[model samples]
Target: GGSGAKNSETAAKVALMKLKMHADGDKSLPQTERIYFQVFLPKGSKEKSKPMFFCHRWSIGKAIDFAASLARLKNDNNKFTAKKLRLCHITSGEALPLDHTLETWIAKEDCPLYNGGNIILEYLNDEEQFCKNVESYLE
Candidate 1:
């Protein structure tokens, strides 16, 4: 009883903190004040289990919706029973192209979530490497 409620509370608090932090700061600003926040995850293995893929739109609302969808999908799927996948929101400035920004974000150590389980953030440009990584993980 205590464990579940406590965990939920902690999660709620963390979510609130994130919301407040993001809202307080100017995520969209001129180049002089812009800051990039990115999220990355490694691709899951399909051989052992059904891997998950979460892609969010450019806005925060879309990110929230995507996250909720992932949660719902996880709950409905039997294979994803206990495992929870993350919906990554890779935010960046207007100064760079999407692919370039994404590649830069993926190279950062701070891109991944703290407690995220086996997630990968990869660039679409590197199709070969991305496929290889996914295949290796599945194997």
Candidate 2:
């Protein structure tokens, strides 16, 4: 009794309508909308890393968490109960001094994974370890 369903095109049209998209002219995103950029993961001491892309704002702290999560996702051998990630400034090359909201850096300059810069994420053993690691960045 469900053969009465419309074709895939009509389903797609309905989906677009649900999302408030109109095809009459140009009903797409405006200039103010933001998008995802690529984040490069440097090769490890043993293996080479690759790029990871994200479409959302990345705070210094948030970026660190993502890095940590990526490591766990990529390496089956890695699994621990720690805070897990770290992020740093590419230039002026400091963390503590430059630490601010994610957009704080992005708004000023090209702070995303692009702009031909590098961000290194390290795994911390535990809360104490992560604190020490961040403290070192301050130094």
Candidate closest to the true structure, highest TM-score: 2
The Cα RMSD of model 1 versus the native structure comes to: 16.9
Candidate 2, residues 1-139: lDDT per residue as tens digits? Answer: 0124567756744543343331222323342233322233444445455444343354454555555565554322236554344544444324411145656555665544333244544443323222333324433
Candidate 1 local Cα displacement, residue 51, angstroms: 3.7
lDDT of 2: 0.41
lDDT of 1 by residue, 19-76 (tens): 4353323322333312223333334443322323232224332433343353333332
Superposed model 2: Cα runs more than 4 Å off: 1-46, 73-83, 96-99, 109-116, 124-139
lDDT of each: 0.33, 0.41
lDDT, model 1, position 48: 27
RMSD of candidates 1 onward, in order: 16.9, 13.2
Report the lDDT of model 2 for residue 31: 22
Assess every candidate by TM-score: 0.19, 0.40
